[PDB]
């Protein structure tokens, strides 16, 4: 005779085995259907995704202010060591 199995089948005939009831440890063994049968529809990766520097620029060179007299001269109302990047922000891709 098989009493344990008989009770499993009995429980399924009386009610909804997807519901849990802690009193009897009534929580049926199952698996993720998407693990048992892999459905590989790929990924929606059309848009590239980027990592940026904390300051959103990365490497900069140092620049002084200049003004036109065309001849150009140092503009003494401007800091002589400003950090500015040329081009796009440094980025990495994931």
């Amino acid at each position: 005779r098989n009493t344990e199995l008989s009770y499993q089948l009995l429980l399924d005939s009386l009610g909804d085995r997807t519901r849990y009831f802690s009193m009897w440890n009534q929580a049926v063994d199952s698996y993720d259907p998407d693990v048992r049968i892999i459905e590989n529809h790929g990924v929606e990766d059309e848009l590239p995704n980027y990592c940026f520097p904390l300051d959103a620029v990365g490497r900069t060179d140092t620049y002084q202010g200049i003004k036109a007299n065309t001849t150009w001269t140092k503009d003494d109302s401007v800091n002589d060591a400003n950090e500015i990047g040329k081009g796009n922000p440094f980025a990495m891709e994931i």
Binding site: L47, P48, Y50, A56, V57, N88, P89, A91
Partner: protein
């Protein structure tokens, strides 16, 4: 062929008139008694309903036609009576606010090419490599906060999968497949013509109005002796031609 209907929201109204004279159902039945108004964009009376632009009249008609619900209050039909192609299951009312382009005083009509948001971090007008510099976004206008812009409200609905239904039944209810008015038409001392007029939202391509004239499309099959099968077809009204 397959039931994947998705343009039901584009109907505005339909009138139904027998012999060019007799508006149906007429009889002062609906709030707008000379036609079926499906949706209203201008609605001074506030006849729209359920937080979208569908009218109280049409919502009554579709709820009676599908569920016999309407004379004793509106409520959710029982799930098993409200199936995949039924009205309530598919009814999707929706609203949004947008900037009021007339009355928001600072409004600027900035086209796509001149908007920026995530400048420096995304590609310009393409799903391509990031370009630009970090800079305040110029778009979209905030609809929220202490500096929310002057706005207007838009509302509408979707109702995919269904066909719109107008039962030829005196109270719109399902009381029998052979309707009360179907039976009365038997005592019509004459033949009648019908005009209908549908008003729809314009679409910039060729579309088709699909009307299902609901009738009895019947066959009776007789097999009197081995290997003999005989069939009598009757579609009525709108009896066949092929």
């Amino acid at each position: 062929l397959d039931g994947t209907f998705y343009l039901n929201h584009t109907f505005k109204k339909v009138s139904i008139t027998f012999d060019s004279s007799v508006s149906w159902p007429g009889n002062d039945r609906l709030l707008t008694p000379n036609e079926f108004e499906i949706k209203r964009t201008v609605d001074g009376e506030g006849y729209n309903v359920a937080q979208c632009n569908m009218t109280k009249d049409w919502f009554l008609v579709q709820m009676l036609a599908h569920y016999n619900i309407g004379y004793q209050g509106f409520y959710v039909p029982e799930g098993y009576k409200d199936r995949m192609y039924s009205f309530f299951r598919n009814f999707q009312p929706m609203s949004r606010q947008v900037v009021d382009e007339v009355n928001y005083k600072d409004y600027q009509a900035v086209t796509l090419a001149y908007q920026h948001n995530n400048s420096g971090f995304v590609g310009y007008l393409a799903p391509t490599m990031r370009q630009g510099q970090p800079y305040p976004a110029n778009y979209p206008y905030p609809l929220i906060g202490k500096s929310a812009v002057t706005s207007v409200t838009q509302k509408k609905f979707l109702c995919d999968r269904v066909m719109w239904r107008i039962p030829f039944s005196s109270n719109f209810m399902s009381m029998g497949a052979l309707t009360d008015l179907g039976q009365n038409m038997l005592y019509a001392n004459s033949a009648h013509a019908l005009d209908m007029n549908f008003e729809v939202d314009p679409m910039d391509e060729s579309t088709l109005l699909y009307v299902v004239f609901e009738v009895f499309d019947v066959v009776r099959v007789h097999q009197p002796h081995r290997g003999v099968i005989e069939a009598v077809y009757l579609r009525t009204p709108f009896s066949a031609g092929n």
